[PDB]
Structure formats: structure tokens, C-alpha cells
């Protein structure tokens, strides 16, 4: 239920100190982004913006 960590996985992948972005094909990272979509979705159903702990809108 700690989807905030699922979302931090995006930054962990973005780390160019380990360059996790390059080793993803289109389909792989598309599955990853849909997994992130799912993880964001549950917290977002809790009436909280997916950008930060508070609402941005």
C-alpha cells in the first residue's frame, strides 16, 4: 500500500549514476509506466494529487 515508493521507483530508474533508462525497450518501459499508472491510481483514489503528498490542483 506504499504506492509513494512505487512512484519513487521512477526516479530510481532515472538515476544516470546507473542509467536504468537505456536498458528498457519500448514495450518494457511501457509496461513499467502502466504499472506506475496503476500504483498512482490507488493513492489518487484517496483524493490526493499524485504530485506530492498534497494536492496541486
Amino acid at each position: 500500500k506504499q504506492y509513494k515508493d512505487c512512484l519513487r521507483l521512477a526516479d530510481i530508474v532515472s538515476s544516470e549514476n546507473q542509467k536504468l533508462y537505456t536498458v528498457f525497450s519500448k514495450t518494457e518501459m511501457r509496461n513499467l509506466l502502466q504499472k506506475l499508472r496503476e500504483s498512482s491510481l490507488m493513492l489518487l483514489d484517496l483524493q490526493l494529487d499524485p504530485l506530492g503528498y498534497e494536492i496541486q490542483s
Partner: protein, 81 residues
């Protein structure tokens, strides 16, 4: 012509609010569907939770801009999921 239409619109809106406050769901539905009123049928059909007639009216009024009020009332009722 548009002045008459708009003024007619708000006037019967306030005319017709009270028994909507009071209930009488079947008759509200009958009259509102007879004269084609989207939002009122919406808000009644979701405080009755009848998603089925929700789709049936969406199909009926696809050309009548049902979905705008659908998205709106969704937004005010905080089920953005």
C-alpha cells in the same frame, strides 16, 4: 429568441427545485425524460446509484452533451477515480 429560451430555462429550474428537494423519484424521472433534462436525471440516477439508466441516458443524449455534466458532477462529488 435566445433571451426567451434562457429565461425560460432558469425560471422553470427554480420552479421545479422544490419537489426535487422533497423526493418522488419515479415521477421526477418520468417528467425529466419526457422533456429531456440531462443534469437532473444525472444527479437523481446517481443518488439512486442506477448506473444502468445512467448508460441508457448517455446513449440517448450522446449528441446532447450529457458527458460534460457527467464529468462535472463527478468532479464535485470527489470520485475522480
Amino acid at each position: 429568441y435566445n433571451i426567451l429560451e434562457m429565461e425560460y430555462a432558469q425560471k422553470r429550474s427554480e420552479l421545479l427545485s422544490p419537489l426535487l428537494i422533497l423526493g418522488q423519484y419515479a415521477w421526477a424521472s418520468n417528467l425529466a425524460e419526457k422533456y429531456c433534462d440531462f443534469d437532473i436525471l444525472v444527479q437523481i440516477c446517481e443518488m439512486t446509484d442506477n448506473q444502468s439508466r445512467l448508460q441508457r441516458y448517455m446513449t440517448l443524449f450522446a449528441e446532447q452533451n450529457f458527458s460534460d455534466f457527467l464529468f462535472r458532477w463527478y468532479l464535485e462529488k470527489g470520485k475522480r477515480g
